[PDB]
Design a protein around this ligand. Structure first.
Ligand SMILES: CC(C)(C)c1cc(NC(=O)Nc2cccc(Cl)c2Cl)n(-c2ccc3c(c2)C[C@@H](C(=O)O)NC3)n1
Length: 270
């Protein structure tokens, strides 16, 4: 603290022991680490080369210092002095939520756990809304599961890392089409209300244990279908009030969609 200039986030590289990369590789340069002096497992995001990709890294770190919520990824410290630069967060032990849902025992991860996981996310988004932060890529793949069904919303920059049809072209721009609000597809602008759309698809994800949205529909077909008022059907075993919440998040006009504050209230009140 005595230091005049000072940064409470900056700390010692040699405190962290870096293990192998996470999620094999399809989540980018994010590593398992141990912060030995605390016996804490961590997730470390590094930056190689001299590069001027450096600007983004420092944006990310500056965003994360602002964000403080039990259901949002939490910055534990950084290393910016010398290469590689490090962003350090707590390791969520069960990995991403999509795979967690797909690979889980449904008796242990039963319907109340699903609804508890959904309430955690809605609460995270309530906080972000209050902060006026637009997430832009909300999806199970960007949520993380920790101990005892703790869920945290993150953003792994997955549009530049995932191969396949998750991120695709629509009218000459790139989108995770299945999570994308119609006005975002058509006008390439985003809002908290477009995150609300994403939230409704994420709900459907949770409710189906990680099925790919719009089954039976060709991707080139979703905009036209949404415009004709097609929406996904209620998943098997999904609570009536949860499906109604989905259908509200998927109102054509952004102004008819609930706020996240309202979405959380629906969870409290259901
Ligand atoms: C809104 C909120 C969910 C709080 C969030 C969380 C992160 N970031 C993050 O969750 N990062 C992370 C995840 C797991 C493990 C680690 Cl070690 C980290 Cl650092 N951002 C974030 C901020 C800025 C940037 C990115 C991500 C990604 C990066 C890119 O364009 O590629 N551009 C800048 N916004």
């Amino acid at each position: 603290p005595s230091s005049p200039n000072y940064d409470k986030w900056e700390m010692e590289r040699t405190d962290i022991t870096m293990k192998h990369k996470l999620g094999g590789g399809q989540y980018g340069e994010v590593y398992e680490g141990v912060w030995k002096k605390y016996s804490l497992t961590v997730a470390v995001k590094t930056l190689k080369e001299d590069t001027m990709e450096v600007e983004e890294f420092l944006k990310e770190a500056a965003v994360m210092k602002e964000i403080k919520h039990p259901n949002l990824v939490q910055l534990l410290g950084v290393c910016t002095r010398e290469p590689p630069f490090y962003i350090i967060t707590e390791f969520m032990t069960y990995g991403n939520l999509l795979d967690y849902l797909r690979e889980c025992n449904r008796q242990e991860v039963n319907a109340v756990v699903l609804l508890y996981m959904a309430t955690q996310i809605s609460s995270a988004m309530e906080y972000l809304e209050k902060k006026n932060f637009i997430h832009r890529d909300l999806a199970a793949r960007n949520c993380l599961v920790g101990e005892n069904h703790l869920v945290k919303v993150a953003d792994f920059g997955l549009s530049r890392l995932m191969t396949g049809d998750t991120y695709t072209a629509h009218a000459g721009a790139k989108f995770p089409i299945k999570w994308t609000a119609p006005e975002s597809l058509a006008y390439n602008k985003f809002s908290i209300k477009s995150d609300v759309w994403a939230f409704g698809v994420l709900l459907w994800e949770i409710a189906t244990y990680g099925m790919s949205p719009y089954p039976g529909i060709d991707l080139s077909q979703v905009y036209e279908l949404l415009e004709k008022d097609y929406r996904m059907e209620r998943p098997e075993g999904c609570p009536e009030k949860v499906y109604e919440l989905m259908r509200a998040c998927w109102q054509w006009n952004p102004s008819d969609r609930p706020s996240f504050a309202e979405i959380h209230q629906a969870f409290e009140t259901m």
